[PDB]
C-alpha cells in the first residue's frame with residue numbers, strides 16, 4: 028500500500044517505533060523482450076538424420092555434423108512414433124528457444140531392450156565396449172521399434188556389434204579394429220584358434236523376436252552451447268534492438284535483463300561475449316549485425332524508510348540509497364516497481380544526499396542533534 | 412489418512428501415453444486434454 | 460566336478476552344492492579340453508573377483 | 509609426382525630456450541583490465557623448443573610426434589613454409605589433414621591419404637621470366653576416402669591443438685631485426701581458424717618450397733615445442749588483450 | 758575505529774531477477790531476513806564506535 | 807590509505823558507461839553487495855578532532 | 856549444478872526438473888552468505 | 904552416505920550414482936571444517 032505498511036510488513040508489528048529501516052530493494056522491470064539470432068532460414072536435415080535408407084552397425088556408429096540452419100525440434104517431440112525421447116542437456120520442450128554452437132548426430136540400430144545402456148555414464152556391453160556418452164553429456168537420446176522396416180525373416184545379420192575389447196574405450200570414440208581377441212593368454216597370431224575370437228557378433232533380427240529383442244532405430248542428438256558463436260537455432264523471430272531502455276533480452280539463447288548500450292569494447296573478429304569479474308555476462312556481439320552491445324543491469328537499489336514512529340505520525344520519508352534524484356522520475360509505473368507503492372515519487376520536495384535521494388523530508392539550514400541518522404552528515408526529525 | 416475432499420477423475424488412454432499421466436510430463440493429452448499440476452497431491456491407477 | 464570317472468545321463472542330470480570354498484577359473488577355464496565355455500551373466504575374466 | 513630427395517647431411521636433435529611464448533586466448537570471451545586464471549594445454553615457459561634448419565646440404569624435414577598439442581614457429585624470408593601434414597601412423601588406413609598455401613590459395617583437405625615419403629612444393633628459380641612460379645607438387649599418390657574440404661582465395665608463429673574432434677589453429681606475424689632466435693617481449697596467438705575434422709593424430713610434418721635431385725632453397729629455420737596441461741595466470745590490458753602471463757609450475 | 762558499513766541482499770545475491778527462484782528461496786524461511794538483520798546490526802555498530 | 811569507495815555518488819554514471827566492464831565496485835553493487843556511507847563525514851571527524 | 860548462471864538454468868530446464876538444480880545454487884549461495892556474515896560479525900567484535 | 908570410507912563408495916557403486924553418495928560426504932565434511940574454523944575464530948577472539 029505505502030512505504031510505512033511495507034516497513035510494518037518487514038518488521039511484523041502494526042506499530043513501528045521512531046527510526047530508519049531497510050526494506051526490499053527496488054528495481055525497474057523490463058517493458059518488453061528482445062530476441063536476437065543470426066538470420067538463417069534453411070531447415071536442418073532431420074529428415075536425412077531419421078529417414079536413412081539404412082542405419083549403421085553400432086560399432087561403426089555413423090556420426091553426422093550439422094550447421095547454419097533452423098531446427099523446429101518440437102516437430103520431432105510431437106512425432107508419437109518415438110518409444111523413448113530422453114533428454115539431458117535440456118528439457119525437450121525448451122529446444123525451440125535455444126541456439127547451439129555445433130550439433131552432432133550419432134546413429135545406429137540396437138535391440139530395443141538395451142536402450143537403457145545408451146543413457147550417459149551407464150554400463151553393459153554396448154555402453155562398455157563400443158559406444159558411450161560422457162558424464163556431462165548435453166543432448167537427447169531417441170529410440171523406436173523398426174521390426175517392420177528392418178527385420179528379415181531369418182534376420183538382417185548385417186547389424187552387428189562388438190563382444191570384445193582390450194579396454195573400455197573412451198567417451199565418444201569408435202573402433203573399426205577387426206583384430207582377433209586373445210581371451211586365453213596364447214598369442215593367437217593369424218585369424219583363428221582355440222580361446223581366440225573374431226571381435227564382433229550380430230543380431231538375428233527375425234520378426235518373431237520378443238519386444239526389444241526386435242530391431243530399434245537409435246539416434247543421439249547432441250550439442251555444445253553458451254561459450255562460442257552459435258550456428259544452429261530454433262524457429263523464434265528476431266525483434267528490434269533498443270538502447271537506453273530496460274528489456275528482457277535474448278541473444279543466441281543468452282537470456283537476461285538490462286539496458287543495452289553501444290559498446291566501446293574493441294572485440295577482435297573472433298569473440299562474441301564479454302563477462303564481468305563475477306563470471307557474469309556484461310557485453311555481447313549482435314548476431315544480425317557484427318557490433319558489440321554493452322549490457323548493464325536495469326536501475327535498482329536499497330529502499331530505506333524513515334519514520335517518527337506510528338505513535339507520533341503515519342507520515343514517513345523514503346531514501347533511495349545510492350540513487351541520484353534524476354533517476355526517481357524514471358521510477359514510474361510505466362513498469363511495475365518491485366516495491367509496488369509510489370506515492371512519495373510525486374516530489375515537490377525531492378532532496379539529493381551523498382547516501383542517495385531522500386523524498387518527503389523538507390531540507391532546512393537550521394541544524395539539530397542527529398535525531399534519525401540518514402547518513403553522510405544528514406539526519407531527520409519531526410518538527411512544525 | 413483422512414482426506415478433506417476426494418475426486419475420482421476417469422477416462423481412457425493409449426498405453427504408450429501413461430507417462431503423460433506422470434505429474435510433470437508433456438505431449439498431447441498432458442498438453443491440451445488432461446493436465447496434472449506440478450504439485451499433484453494424490454494417487455493414479457490404470458489397467459488395460 | 461570335471462575329473463569324475465562316470466557322469467550321469469542328461470535324463471538323470473546330477474547337481475552339486477559348491478559352498479564355503481574358493482572357486483577359481485584359473486585352472487578350470489585354462490584347461491584346453493573345454494571345447495565350450497559360454498557364460499551369459501558375466502564375462503569369463505570377471506568370475507574370480 | 510612423388511620422389512625421394514635423399515640429397516642431405518643427417519644430424520642429431522638440437523634445442524634452444526623457448527622463453528615466454530605459446531600463450532593464446534583460452535576461450536572466445538573478451539576481457540579487459542583484469543587478471544584471470546585457467547587450466548589448459550600450453551607451452552611450458554623456458555622449456556627446450558627443438559630447433560631445425562633449411563640450408564643450401566641440410567633440409568631438416570623429419571616426421572615429428574604430435575601428442576597432446578604442438579607449437580610451431582619459423583624465422584623466414586620468401587615464405588618458404590608452404591604448409592603442413594598431420595596424421596596417425598600414415599599409410600592410408602586412417603584419415604589425415606593436409607594444409608598448403610600455394611601461390612593462389614590456402615587449401616585444407618582431409619582424406620585417408622597416401623602421402624609421399626619426403627614431400628615438398630617446387631618453384632622455378634628465376635627461370636627466364638624475371639620471376640618465380642610453382643611448377644611442381646610431390647605430396648601424394650592417392651586421396652579416395654575424403655571427409656572435409658576447403659580452399660581460400662620475419663617470424664611466423666602458430667599453435668595447433670586437436671581436442672574432442674576440433675583442430676584449432678592459432679597464429680601470429682611479426683617483423684624481425686634479431687639475427688636468429690625467439691625474441692624477448694611476447695604476445696598471445698590470435699585464433700586464426702577451427703576445423704571440426706574429428707581425426708586421430710600421432711605425427712606431423714611441414715611442407716617447404718624448393719635432374720630429379722640437386723636443389724636449392726633459402727636459408728630458414730623453424731622451432732617446435734609441445735603443449736603440456738598447466739595452470740596459467742594472464743592479464744588483459746584496457747584495450748582488452750593479453751599483455752602478461754605466468755605458469756603456476 | 759570502524760570497518761566499511763555493508764548491506765547484502767539475499768534475494769538479489771542468490772536469486773537475482775528470477776521470480777521462481779525467489780519463490781524457492783522462501784522455503785528456507787526467515788534466513789533471508791536474518792542475514793540483512795545481522796548486517797544492519799554491524800552497520801549501526803560502526804556509527805556507535 | 808587506499809579505498810574501495812565510501813559510496814561517493816555511484817549514480818550509474820560510471821557503472822553504466824565504459825567503466826562497468828572493468829571495475830570490481832560495479833560487479834559488487836550489481837550483485838547486491840552495497841557499501842554504505844558512515845554517519846560522520848571526514849569534514850566532521852576533522853572538526854571533532 | 857549443471858551451470859552456475861541462474862538464468863542459464865531457467866533457459867535450459869522446465870519448472871519441475873530445474874528446481875533440483877536451483878535448490879543447489881540456493882544451498883551453496885546461502886552457505887556463502889552465512890560464511891560471510893559470520894566472518895563479518897567476528898570482525899565487528901575485533902573492531903569494536 | 905552408505906559409508907564414510909571413501910573407497911567403499913567409489914568401488915561398490917557406479918560413477919553417476921556414487922557421485923550422489925559422494926556429494927553427501929563433501930557437504931558434511933565441509934560443514935565440519937567450517938564448524939571447526941568458526942569455533943577457532945570465536946575462541947581466538949577470547950584468547951586475544
Ligand SMILES: *[C@@H]1O[C@H](CO)[C@@H](O[C@@H]2O[C@H](CO)[C@@H](O[C@H]3O[C@H](CO)[C@@H](O)[C@H](O)[C@@H]3O)[C@H](O)[C@H]2NC(C)=O)[C@H](O)[C@H]1NC(C)=O
Nearest residue numbers: 072073074075076077078079102103104106107108109171
Ligand atoms: C520421415 O519422412 C516422413 C515422410 O515425409 C515424415 O513424416 C510425415 O510428415 C508429414 C508432415 O511433414 C505428415 O503429412 C501429413 O499427415 C497428416 C494426415 O492426416 C496431416 O494431418 C498432417 O498435417 C500432414 O500434412 C505425414 O503423416 C508423416 N508420415 C509418416 C509416415 O510419419 C517424417 O517427418 C520424417 N521422420 C521424422 C521422424 O521426422
Ligand SMILES: *[C@@H]1O[C@H](CO)[C@@H](O[C@@H]2O[C@H](CO)[C@@H](O[C@H]3O[C@H](CO)[C@@H](O)[C@H](O)[C@@H]3O)[C@H](O)[C@H]2NC(C)=O)[C@H](O)[C@H]1NC(C)=O
Nearest residue numbers: 460461462463464483484485486487488489490491492493
Ligand atoms: C583333471 O585332473 C588332472 C590331474 O591332476 C589335471 O591335469 C594336470 O593339469 C595341470 C595344468 O593345469 C598340469 O600341470 C603341469 O603343467 C606343466 C607340465 O609340463 C608344467 O608347466 C606345470 O608346472 C605343471 O607341472 C598337469 O601336468 C596335468 N596332469 C596330468 C596328469 O595331465 C587337470 O588339469 C584336471 N582338470 C580339471 C578340469 O579338473
Ligand SMILES: *[C@@H]1O[C@H](CO)[C@@H](O[C@@H]2O[C@H](CO)[C@@H](O[C@H]3O[C@H](CO)[C@@H](O)[C@H](O)[C@@H]3O)[C@H](O)[C@H]2NC(C)=O)[C@H](O)[C@H]1NC(C)=O
Nearest residue numbers: 087203205600601602603619620621650651652653654655
Ligand atoms: C575407405 O576405403 C576402403 C578401402 O578402399 C573401403 O573399404 C573397402 O570396401 C569394400 C566394399 O565396398 C570391401 O570389399 C569387400 O567386401 C566384403 C568384406 O568382408 C568381402 O566379402 C568382398 O569380397 C570384398 O572383398 C573392401 O575389402 C574394403 N577395403 C578394406 C581395406 O577394408 C571403404 O569403403 C572406404 N570408406 C569410405 C567411407 O569410402
Ligand SMILES: *[C@@H]1O[C@H](CO)[C@@H](O[C@@H]2O[C@H](CO)[C@@H](O)[C@H](O)[C@H]2NC(C)=O)[C@H](O)[C@H]1NC(C)=O
Nearest residue numbers: 350351352353354379380381814815816817819
Ligand atoms: C545527478 O545527475 C545529473 C544528470 O547527469 C547531474 O547533472 C550533471 O552534472 C555535471 C557535474 O556538475 C555536469 O557536468 C552536467 O552538465 C550535468 N548534466 C545535466 C543534464 O544537468 C547531477 O550533477 C548529478 N548529481 C551529482 C551530485 O553529480
Ligand SMILES: *[C@@H]1O[C@H](CO)[C@@H](O[C@@H]2O[C@H](CO)[C@@H](O)[C@H](O)[C@H]2NC(C)=O)[C@H](O)[C@H]1NC(C)=O
Nearest residue numbers: 509510511512513514623624625626646649720
Ligand atoms: C624411396 O626409397 C625407399 C627406400 O629408402 C623406398 O621404400 C621401399 O619401397 C618398397 C616398395 O616399392 C617397399 O617394399 C620397401 O619396404 C620400402 N622400404 C622402406 C624402408 O620404406 C621407396 O620405394 C622409394 N620411393 C620412390 C618414389 O623412389
Ligand SMILES: *[C@@H]1O[C@H](CO)[C@@H](O)[C@H](O)[C@H]1NC(C)=O
Nearest residue numbers: 064065066067313314315316
Ligand atoms: C539479416 O538479414 C539482413 C538483410 O537480408 C542481412 O543484411 C544480415 O546480414 C542478416 N543476418 C545475418 C546473420 O547474415
Ligand SMILES: *[C@@H]1O[C@H](CO)[C@@H](O)[C@H](O)[C@H]1NC(C)=O
Nearest residue numbers: 042044336337338339340341
Ligand atoms: C503515544 O505514546 C504515549 C506514551 O506511551 C501515550 O500516552 C499515547 O496515548 C500514545 N498514542 C496513542 C494514540 O495511544
Ligand SMILES: *[C@@H]1O[C@H](CO)[C@@H](O)[C@H](O)[C@H]1NC(C)=O
Nearest residue numbers: 378388389390391392393394
Ligand atoms: C540555505 O542556505 C542556502 C545558501 O547557503 C540557500 O540557497 C537556501 O535557500 C537556504 N535555505 C534555508 C531554508 O535557509
Ligand SMILES: *[C@@H]1O[C@H](CO)[C@@H](O)[C@H](O)[C@H]1NC(C)=O
Nearest residue numbers: 522523524525554555556557
Ligand atoms: C635442454 O636440453 C639440454 C641438452 O641440450 C639439457 O642439458 C637441459 O637440461 C635441457 N633443459 C630443459 C629445461 O629441458
Ligand SMILES: *[C@@H]1O[C@H](CO)[C@@H](O)[C@H](O)[C@H]1NC(C)=O
Nearest residue numbers: 200595596597707708709710
Ligand atoms: C591414434 O593412432 C595411434 C597410432 O596407431 C594409436 O596408438 C592411438 O590409439 C590412436 N588414438 C586414437 C584416439 O584413436
Ligand SMILES: *[C@@H]1O[C@H](CO)[C@@H](O)[C@H](O)[C@H]1NC(C)=O
Nearest residue numbers: 610611612613614615642659
Ligand atoms: C592450389 O591448390 C589446389 C589443390 O591442389 C590446386 O587446384 C590449385 O591449382 C593450386 N594453385 C596453384 C597456383 O597451383
Ligand SMILES: *[C@@H]1O[C@H](CO)[C@@H](O)[C@H](O)[C@H]1NC(C)=O
Nearest residue numbers: 632634635636637639641643
Ligand atoms: C613463364 O611464365 C608462364 C606463365 O605466365 C609460364 O607458362 C612459363 O612456363 C614460365 N617460364 C618458365 C621458364 O617456366
Ligand SMILES: *[C@@H]1O[C@H](CO)[C@@H](O)[C@H](O)[C@H]1NC(C)=O
Nearest residue numbers: 293745746747748749750751
Ligand atoms: C590501445 O588503444 C589506444 C586508443 O585507441 C591506442 O592508442 C593504442 O594504439 C591501442 N593499442 C592496441 C594494441 O590496440
